[PDB]
Amino acid sequence: TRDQNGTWEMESNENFEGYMKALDIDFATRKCAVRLTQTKVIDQDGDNFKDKTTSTFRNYDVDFTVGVEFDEYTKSLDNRHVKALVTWEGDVLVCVQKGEKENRGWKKWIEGDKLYLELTCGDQVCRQVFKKK
Amino acid sequence: TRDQNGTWEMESNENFEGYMKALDIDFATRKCAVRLTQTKVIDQDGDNFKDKTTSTFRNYDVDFTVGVEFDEYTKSLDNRHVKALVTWEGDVLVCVQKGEKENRGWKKWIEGDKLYLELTCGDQVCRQVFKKK
């Protein structure tokens, strides 16, 4: 069949490491790209194609309610276990994760068209910045 | 404002390595995710949240026409230059990337419910297998 439209998620990929070697990718990048999942989207018009591949590492879905404390299994990070309590401080969404590490929490808020996420653990502060899309 | 719905693409992310270090993520995993771009999708209903994150290492768009030759800048792989010519051999979509390396091309073909990808550079063959969705 020549009809290749649709979304195809990779399920097996072999000798990717070698194909990347003969292309002269550095070793650091190689031992990463083999951890990403790939997803192909092909749009076909007889013989006119528009296909976009995407290598996606891991992803977390957390669905909760503010004021409630709930169970967060930080799979895709360190699979640690915390008690997460979320509260508002003005317009800023603040969570603290009561558990193994101290100062494990985050802050998220909207300022114009960029969403600000601060991630803090220990004496480390991570600053994440997102523009809408 | 407390309204955080929408799709957020990260544009700057700093001290991610430090935040992850204090989480004791291993050095190999750390030196990876600092390459990932991150995309957040927030679903809000008053005080009830549904957040889904993603992390994207690299992404490629190649849009062409069979029989026609075009220039492919292999971003997301080695950011090299090839002239790519795509042709059918039956139900097998065949490309050759004439450029620096020998045998640089690929084969794509469908067998029912799965898409098969064969990737070759030089003497190395990568075989990828995808299921529809």
Curated annotation (Swiss-Prot), chains A, B:
Forms a beta-barrel structure that accommodates hydrophobic ligands in its interior. It comes from the Eukaryota. It comes from Homo sapiens. The keyword Lipid metabolism does not apply. CDD domains: CRBP2. One of its GO terms (molecular function) is molecular carrier activity. This is Retinol-binding protein 2. Keywords: Cytoplasm, Retinol-binding, Transport, Vitamin A. One of its GO terms (biological process) is fatty acid transport. The lineage of its organism: Eukaryota, Metazoa, Chordata, Craniata, Vertebrata. Its main location: cytoplasm. The keyword Ribonucleoprotein does not apply.
